[PDB]
Amino acid sequence: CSLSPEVGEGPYFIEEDIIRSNIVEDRIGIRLNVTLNLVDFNTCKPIKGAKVYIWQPDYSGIYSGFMDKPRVKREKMYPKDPRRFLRGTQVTNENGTVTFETLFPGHYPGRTPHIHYRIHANGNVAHIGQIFFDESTSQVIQSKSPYNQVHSRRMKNEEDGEFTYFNGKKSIINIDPQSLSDSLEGILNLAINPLHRSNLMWA
Numbered sequence: 001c002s003l004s005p006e007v008g009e010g011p012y013f014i015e016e017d018i019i020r021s022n023i024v025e026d027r028i029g030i031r032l033n034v035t036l037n038l039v040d041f042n043t044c045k046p047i048k049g050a051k052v053y054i055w056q057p058d059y060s061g062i063y064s065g066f067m068d069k070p071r072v073k074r075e076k077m078y079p080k081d082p083r084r085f086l087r088g089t090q091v092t093n094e095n096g097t098v099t100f101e102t103l104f105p106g107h108y109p110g111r112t113p114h115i116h117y118r119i120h121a122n123g124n125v126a127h128i129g130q131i132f133f134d135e136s137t138s139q140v141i142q143s144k145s146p147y148n149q150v151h152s153r154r155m156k157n158e159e160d161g162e163f164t165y166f167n168g169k170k171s172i173i174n175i176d177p178q179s180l181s182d183s184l185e186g187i188l189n190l191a192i193n194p195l196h197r198s199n200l201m202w203a
């Protein structure tokens with residue numbers, strides 16, 4: 001029940017309430033259910049009412065809102081298209097839990113596969129992080145369609161700057177092995193400080 005690491009937001013958060021479980025839209029990939037259980041790191045008690053946002057790239061490494069191929073990092077990052085696939089928000093229930101129906105994320109040059117998340121509690125940005133995957137799980141996914149028709153080198157977790165800098169080992173989702181055989185099933189327990197103001201947002 002130790003404090004989960006924070007990880008940089010990166011440049012592609014879009015602060016919009018899109019409150020839905022299934023975030024897939026028209027995207028193609030392998031279905032993945034992601035369950036996040038939040039607890040207060042002081043007490044280990046579930047946190048109720050916290051808004052959890054996630055965003056992630058599609059199989060080819062594309063973020064919605066930023067679909068133009070050359071995305072250049074800037075001070076002022078604004079979306080240039082209205083698409084919002086693979087983005088959503090859910091509110092934690094009585095047990096501190098949200099579930100999202102998503103896809104396994106793509107990689108893009110210079111990054112390992114990951115899902116971004118951001119948590120609002122008490123009118124503050126309490127926690128910003130990233131979800132990483134076990135190397136064995138990543139391997140199995142890359143041998144499947146459509147990920148097997150992306151031909152770029154996949155960066156591994158140990159090569160990834162964000163994983164290394166921000167202690168990504170503590171943020172690896174646990175995939176049920178049973179479910180690598182309708183939909184993959186992942187659980188990640190997080191311990192956060194709901195009275196923290198994160199300074200890891202881009203803007």
Ligand SMILES: C[As](C)(=O)[O-]
Pocket residue numbers: 051120121122123124125
């Ligand atoms: C108004 As809020 C808890 O989404 O920062």
Ligand SMILES: [Fe+3]
Pocket residue numbers: 010116
């Ligand atoms: Fe990213």
